[PDB]
Structure formats: structure tokens, C-alpha cells
Amino acid sequence: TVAYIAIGSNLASPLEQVNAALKALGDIPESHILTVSSFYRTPPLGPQDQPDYLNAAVALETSLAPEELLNHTQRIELQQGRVRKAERWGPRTLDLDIMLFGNEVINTERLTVPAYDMKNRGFMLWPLFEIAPELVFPDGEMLRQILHTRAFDKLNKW
């Protein structure tokens, strides 16, 4: 199954944090990284003297159950992020989001797929479009269509 994961990092030097995250992702059991989008850039939240967020999309082939994949993304966030020496929601941390899992729709307390409100998030949709231009959501909605009809903030590459 092809799962699509969104990477978000505004910690230290994002470039090497995203690279450490990609290595962790590729080490996930029963999983193989198909492709990685270009790195995209978004402004910090709060003080503007912060680092920009580095955003990216990853196509990951996997035989893991959705919840098993979530387990590992959550583990990597803890191991790579700064949760121990900071806060869970800490300003500068690592975000791994399961945007899509095959053509599956998952509505449960622990995991929502497609990721809730991702269709309104350009920093997720644009990188996803770069690696999967023909992508269609489970509800039949085409990615290319959403990008033509919804208003998004400007998204420059890193």
C-alpha cells in the first residue's frame, strides 16, 4: 500500500532534521520510500526571528496496518523531535503526518485518513502534487482540481 506522509520541521537546521527523519522513515519495518518531494518553506509561528518550517511529502510503500504506521511516525517524532528537552507541542519540533493510506478512509479516535483538513493546507497539497500529480482522494476528488479551486498562501521551495 502506498501511504503519503507529510514532513514538517522547524528545528535547528531543518535541512539535516528532515534528512534524519527520512532515514528513520526508510528504516520503518515492512516499508520502502518510493519518492520524496522537493523541500518547501513556510514562515514561523509567533516571533518571526524563528526558523522557517521545512515542508515535504513522502510516498511510502508499506505492508503495515495504518495504526502500525502511526506507531512508527509517532516514535520518530519523539526520537528525532525535542519533546524530552521541551514540550510535546513545542514551537520547534518534528511533524510526521499520515495524509493518505492507499485509498483507505479511516475514521477513529486515534487516526483520521485522509488527514483532517489537509485539503485546505497548501504546504501539504503542493508537495504532494509534485510527487503524485494524478492523485485522487477516496471521495473521488482530484488533487489537481483542489489546487485550481481553493485559495492557498504562497509556497516557495526551500
Curated annotation (Swiss-Prot):
Thermal properties: Thermostable. Retains 75% of its activity after heating 30 minutes at 96 degrees Celsius.
Pathway linked to the protein: Cofactor biosynthesis; tetrahydrofolate biosynthesis; 2-amino-4-hydroxy-6-hydroxymethyl-7,8-dihydropteridine diphosphate from 7,8-dihydroneopterin triphosphate: step 4/4
Top enzyme category: transferase
Assigned keywords, A-Z: ATP-binding, Folate biosynthesis, Kinase, Nucleotide-binding, Transferase
Any one GO molecular-function label of the UniProt entry: ATP binding
InterPro entries recorded: Hppk (IPR000550), Hppk_sf (IPR035907)
Domain of life: Bacteria
Keyword Plastid recorded: no
Presence of the UniProt keyword Transferase in the record: yes
GO biological process terms, semicolon-separated: folic acid biosynthetic process; tetrahydrofolate biosynthetic process
Entry EC number(s): 2.7.6.3
Any one Pfam family match given in the protein's UniProt record, by short name: HPPK
Reaction(s) catalysed (UniProt annotation): 6-hydroxymethyl-7,8-dihydropterin + ATP = (7,8-dihydropterin-6-yl)methyl diphosphate + AMP + H(+)
Family: Belongs to the HPPK family.
Function description: Catalyzes the transfer of pyrophosphate from adenosine triphosphate (ATP) to 6-hydroxymethyl-7,8-dihydropterin, an enzymatic step in folate biosynthesis pathway.
Self-association and partners: Monomer.
Descriptive protein name: 2-amino-4-hydroxy-6-hydroxymethyldihydropteridine pyrophosphokinase
Organism the protein comes from: Escherichia coli (strain K12)
